[PDB]
Design a protein around this ligand. Structure first.
Ligand code: CPB
Length: 127
């Protein structure tokens, strides 16, 4: 099987806005997670071909990853901060769905998720 196309990251027909929460999600949340020692599996769409995971996209029907999230932020694709938060949550839950408790890849995701939740708890109030 080939890989699916990646999630959309730009749509010139969508309206765009700047908000302090979206700025924070890029400047603080995405950039901090990106540097984490276990970030690398989550920095781009899961390449099921290269990883030899022929059933990945039979099980995961709503793919998400931090490369896509980053591009969405940088393209002003999100109108609401909640959309971006949902995408991070989709990324983590996809890993937990595909895999099993205690797998190394799951514990990697859990470490990123703990950091994510700390940074989301520090999300600024809307201006
Ligand atoms: C050797 N083994 C390691 C785990 C890997 C694997 C899984 O078993 C299950 C997964 O859900 C993922 C994933 O989401 C991302 C990456 C990944 C992606 C890019 C670079 C490195 C890695 Cl580890 O790998 C995954 C695959 O079985 C090959």
């Amino acid at each position: 099987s080939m890989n699916p196309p990646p999630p959309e990251t730009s749509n010139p027909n969508k309206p765009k806005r700047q908000t302090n929460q979206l700025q924070y999600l890029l400047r603080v949340v995405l950039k901090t997670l990106w540097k984490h020692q276990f970030a690398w599996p989550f920095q781009q769409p899961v390449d099921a071909v290269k990883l030899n995971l022929p059933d990945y996209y039979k099980i995961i029907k709503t793919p998400m990853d931090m490369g896509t999230i980053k591009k969405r932020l940088e393209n002003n694709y999100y109108w609401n901060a909640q959309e971006c938060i949902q995408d991070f949550n989709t990324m983590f839950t996809n890993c937990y769905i595909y895999n099993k408790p205690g797998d190394d890849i799951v514990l990697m995701a859990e470490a990123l998720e703990k950091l994510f939740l700390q940074k989301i708890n520090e999300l600024p109030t809307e201006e």
